[PDB]
Design a protein around this ligand. Sequence first.
Ligand SMILES: NC(=O)c1ccc[n+]([C@@H]2O[C@H](COP(=O)([O-])OP(=O)(O)OC[C@H]3O[C@@H](n4cnc5c(N)ncnc54)[C@H](OP(=O)(O)O)[C@@H]3O)[C@@H](O)[C@H]2O)c1
Ligand SMILES: NC(=O)c1ccc[n+]([C@@H]2O[C@H](COP(=O)([O-])OP(=O)(O)OC[C@H]3O[C@@H](n4cnc5c(N)ncnc54)[C@H](OP(=O)(O)O)[C@@H]3O)[C@@H](O)[C@H]2O)c1
Ligand SMILES: NC(=O)c1ccc[n+]([C@@H]2O[C@H](COP(=O)([O-])OP(=O)(O)OC[C@H]3O[C@@H](n4cnc5c(N)ncnc54)[C@H](OP(=O)(O)O)[C@@H]3O)[C@@H](O)[C@H]2O)c1
Ligand SMILES: Nc1nc2cccc(-c3ccccc3)c2n1Cc1ccc(Cl)c(Cl)c1
Ligand SMILES: Nc1nc2cccc(-c3ccccc3)c2n1Cc1ccc(Cl)c(Cl)c1
Ligand SMILES: Nc1nc2cccc(-c3ccccc3)c2n1Cc1ccc(Cl)c(Cl)c1
Ligand SMILES: Nc1nc2cccc(-c3ccccc3)c2n1Cc1ccc(Cl)c(Cl)c1
Ligand SMILES: [Cl-]
Ligand SMILES: [Cl-]
Lengths: 249, 249, 248, 249
Amino acid sequence: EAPAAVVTGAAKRIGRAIAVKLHQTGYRVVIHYHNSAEAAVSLADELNKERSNTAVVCQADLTNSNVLPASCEEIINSCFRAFGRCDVLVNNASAFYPTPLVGKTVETQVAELIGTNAIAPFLLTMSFAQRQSNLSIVNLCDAMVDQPCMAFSLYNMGKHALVGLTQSAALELAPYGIRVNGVAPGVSLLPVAMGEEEKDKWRRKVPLGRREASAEQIADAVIFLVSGSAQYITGSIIKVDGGLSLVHA
Amino acid sequence: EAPAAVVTGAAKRIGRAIAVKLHQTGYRVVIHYHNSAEAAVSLADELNKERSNTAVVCQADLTNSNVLPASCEEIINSCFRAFGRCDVLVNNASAFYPTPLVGKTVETQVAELIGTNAIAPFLLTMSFAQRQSNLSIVNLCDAMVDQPCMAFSLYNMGKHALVGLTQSAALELAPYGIRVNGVAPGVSLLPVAMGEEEKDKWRRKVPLGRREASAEQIADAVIFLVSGSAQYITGSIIKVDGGLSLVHA
Amino acid sequence: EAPAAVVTGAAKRIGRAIAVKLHQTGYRVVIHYHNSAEAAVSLADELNKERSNTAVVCQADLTNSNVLPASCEEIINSCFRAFGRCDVLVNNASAFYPTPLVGKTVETQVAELIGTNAIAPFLLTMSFAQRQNLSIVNLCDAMVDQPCMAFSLYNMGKHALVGLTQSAALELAPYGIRVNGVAPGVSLLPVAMGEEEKDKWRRKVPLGRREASAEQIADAVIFLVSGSAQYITGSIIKVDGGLSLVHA
Amino acid sequence: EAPAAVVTGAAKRIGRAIAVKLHQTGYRVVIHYHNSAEAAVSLADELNKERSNTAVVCQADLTNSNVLPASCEEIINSCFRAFGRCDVLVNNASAFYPTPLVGKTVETQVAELIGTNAIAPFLLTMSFAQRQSNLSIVNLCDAMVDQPCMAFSLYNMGKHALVGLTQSAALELAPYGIRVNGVAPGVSLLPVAMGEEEKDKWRRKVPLGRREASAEQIADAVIFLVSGSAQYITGSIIKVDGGLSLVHA
Ligand SMILES: NC(=O)c1ccc[n+]([C@@H]2O[C@H](COP(=O)([O-])OP(=O)(O)OC[C@H]3O[C@@H](n4cnc5c(N)ncnc54)[C@H](OP(=O)(O)O)[C@@H]3O)[C@@H](O)[C@H]2O)c1
Ligand SMILES: NC(=O)c1ccc[n+]([C@@H]2O[C@H](COP(=O)([O-])OP(=O)(O)OC[C@H]3O[C@@H](n4cnc5c(N)ncnc54)[C@H](OP(=O)(O)O)[C@@H]3O)[C@@H](O)[C@H]2O)c1
Ligand SMILES: NC(=O)c1ccc[n+]([C@@H]2O[C@H](COP(=O)([O-])OP(=O)(O)OC[C@H]3O[C@@H](n4cnc5c(N)ncnc54)[C@H](OP(=O)(O)O)[C@@H]3O)[C@@H](O)[C@H]2O)c1
Ligand SMILES: Nc1nc2cccc(-c3ccccc3)c2n1Cc1ccc(Cl)c(Cl)c1
Ligand SMILES: Nc1nc2cccc(-c3ccccc3)c2n1Cc1ccc(Cl)c(Cl)c1
Ligand SMILES: Nc1nc2cccc(-c3ccccc3)c2n1Cc1ccc(Cl)c(Cl)c1
Ligand SMILES: Nc1nc2cccc(-c3ccccc3)c2n1Cc1ccc(Cl)c(Cl)c1
Ligand SMILES: [Cl-]
Ligand SMILES: [Cl-]
């Protein structure tokens, strides 16, 4: 039997690259999505024509709410429903926008940036472990967590909380043989709405090649962490940042 | 006039010592409480008997909700109402208990462990800065953040979040001359819930004197950070842990 | 033609496993050693049986002195004379013993613990870079911020190696030379160490209650030098079973 | 009886401001120097005019050699000879200059940058402890140690080794009640050789006030760490960097 993986926010960009690379290694995959129904279904179709019955979609909003635990339990349940097992959880889904200290309410911003980035990852981890061989969880972290961007405090808080979850769950789940690790991009695929001239300003700051990470380059690191080549690795966050985090002001 | 300080969770233990010490240095103080009304009023009385009209109490329940933004606004407001200024915010209020990955509802667990530990400090920081000399904020961090205790993931996530806030807010509020720093205790006042045979097992682990920090040792570090002796210091987290975080397994 | 790797302290233990896995990946290998000539030679022979003229040995002491720069220049040179190229440098060699703050002279302890752990890696990095998927992998310590009692000079050396890893990543990036670290927690324990003591350390490891095999450490090194890690530089991968996350 | 302090590289700049403040706090001081003979003697005079018999000078080259241990033992001996005691060691002396990977030999560069920045602090710590109340050591670290400057690898290596020393000695010297801590500046007093346009380029990067730390601001943090207000603090490195280490590329 082939192993199964849940990837959150897997319809496009980095999430899709990870689901594709997992599927290419031989994983059956759950492609979780929020609004990107069209993109997600088309990915699933794509992968299913490669191998029949190896990809399903799963819709869920990961905003913090009182029914977030139910939603996260369901995401994991969908993997068991489809594939009778769940071996890998990748926490990739992320809300991302500024929340200046000095549109949406603050209660919504906390709910979205903390829920999707930290609370849903925590709840998914609970459901993944409670439902339970190379078992592991990989969290998409931020290489730049300790050199935060101006006006992004809630996002930064959620990514910091994600590091704590990675480390706490690695420690707590190690007795059950579940590894928990992180992949920390610096700059990878830039926001869709960003202009080119702004994109280059940011690219030029990367010491290694003055370019952003490709989605595949990020995916390669997730693949390593789930493989038998990382069997003793738990609680590690691998930066994939071409040295961005080492560059002073 | 005398500068004014807000200390959250100021009725007992560490918050009390901070409020007492700020007051001895010459601050006017807001003693915030949620449950401990009697103890907060008792403190204010002792501080006022020392210097008239220098200590007031403020009630606010710091558990994450749609009304947490209002509670946090109120706390900052009560300082400006009492003293006509707010120079110092000490984010000291803290919920603390386990949340095993494998009682309260998890919605309540998140409200308290992320709500009061990280979201309230964010909202208090916003309101402090919105309302604005030696201005600073001091956050009660955890020196053991990167060596988390088993089954304490939500606690640990909120304290990780707090580091993110400290660093993000330090950066974003610097242009206002607002400094944002942390004090990170190791072992503090051991739970009266705990016994004594157990209490020493945790005590003997501290390299410096095999004892816990007093609340006043913690407060000393807060006093330093708010003083004119730390006017170039922002984004720094001072461990007051007697060497604890440095001890390997 | 196949790429070429230099592995310091390659005769035994972690160094041997890395040299083997590199060789198995298709690398030609320079096997550096200090005192383990028999093990370094018999490793070269075994590898050369597998693929002819793919392994050589190179002797050098990595202690700090006025001749260390020449010794490190010669290690790098040997890879070029053997194989006509040098694509990978693994800084693995390590002196390891306690240096309490309160019968080697202290200046010898500095020479050995700082020279081999930090200074020799720096000089090798210099020679490697001047001579040019190029990368360097330094063997760091996952426990670098939770130091053992009475290992200050060892701990200083390993902390300095983090500095080197990050400084050289930044400085060599314009040449497309990546520089990374692999940080073990507990790996191969002294074979002389009593089993009962061996078990006190293993039990502290959350993942599996055992030390890392040499091969598991090597796997991280293989990942970092591969095409799967081409955007990775200045990164230090812990291979510690969660050890560094365990409080007192 | 007054306590006694050793400050290395105390003739000028930050070491001098540290000696001056220790002296103002009540300490007797050993003013160590290498080359700055006139300045060191000039400081001891200033200090002795203020309180007679409270300052001495001590010459030593702190470059790594087989006599470096004898020189470090001598610096510590000098304090005991003048004052009968030695309560505080400040490791401040530092060689600083680029050592690119691609007029000094590499031997001398290693000997100076590693010797002064790391080995000499190790040997002074050793001699200090061996010769043995509120005893402590303060090491002058670097806030930017994980964000290195291009071509400063050996200097950065020495500063990294200094962190390991700080933490290692904190653990090892705790049972003797000797605390070991660090002060980590970002930019303070800029190089003499440096031109003014360059100075303002670097100055402009500091979020808190767009200026470098004064020597006195660095000394304030050292004073806190040696004081009774830091008795439970060991193994801690306080940044005094105005937020510099928090700024992304
Ligand atoms: N890209 C970078 O430069 C970079 C840098 C640092 C860290 N990271 C981290 O790496 C990961 C992948 O990066 P990315 O750029 O590919 O991410 P992204 O495009 O910003 O987000 C990935 C997915 O997150 C999902 N999402 C957003 N809000 C959600 C919600 N409320 N509920 C459920 N899902 C929600 C979206 O799914 P739908 O489209 O279905 O709505 C989105 O497609 C993220 O976790 C990110 O934070 C990336
Ligand atoms: N084992 C662990 O639990 C662990 C944990 C943390 C970090 N590490 C690090 O991982 C790396 C490999 O570990 P290991 O345990 O396999 O190492 P090791 O057996 O302790 O040492 C490996 C080799 O280093 C060489 N070496 C020692 N002193 C030298 C000198 N003065 N000049 C030149 N070479 C010298 C020796 O070569 P010869 O035998 O030829 O004389 C020795 O065999 C090391 O850098 C180590 O510090 C290991
Ligand atoms: N921007 C900053 O200033 C900054 C930033 C980060 C960290 N730091 C650290 O903070 C500390 C103080 O900074 P600073 O700028 O005042 O330092 P500095 O002026 O550059 O050097 C301090 C003193 O160390 C002495 N010294 C140099 N080489 C020596 C040797 N080979 N043997 C004995 N003594 C030697 C010199 O003494 P003589 O003059 O008597 O010859 C010098 O006056 C240093 O440890 C530094 O690394 C400073
Ligand atoms: N890793 C990360 N965390 C971020 C938090 C808020 C904003 C960004 C961001 C995203 C795109 C372009 C610039 C900053 C964030 N990024 C990407 C990033 C951050 C800093 C820098 Cl200097 C770069 Cl070139 C990219
Ligand atoms: N700083 C901190 N964060 C914690 C998170 C969960 C539990 C504890 C804790 C508190 C009291 C006694 C034991 C563990 C936590 N502590 C206190 C603590 C942690 C680790 C150790 Cl070895 C000790 Cl003696 C005290
Ligand atoms: N990573 C590392 N750095 C060390 C520095 C000095 C000594 C040891 C060591 C080695 C073998 C057994 C115990 C400590 C060192 N180790 C291995 C180690 C360290 C701490 C712990 Cl709790 C374990 Cl189990 C292994
Ligand atoms: N803290 C520190 N460590 C250094 C290592 C090498 C060079 C410098 C340096 C000093 C003066 C001006 C620029 C870089 C170093 N500094 C000062 C410094 C480093 C980075 C930045 Cl952006 C700044 Cl304004 C100052
Ligand atoms: Cl896409
Ligand atoms: Cl409260």
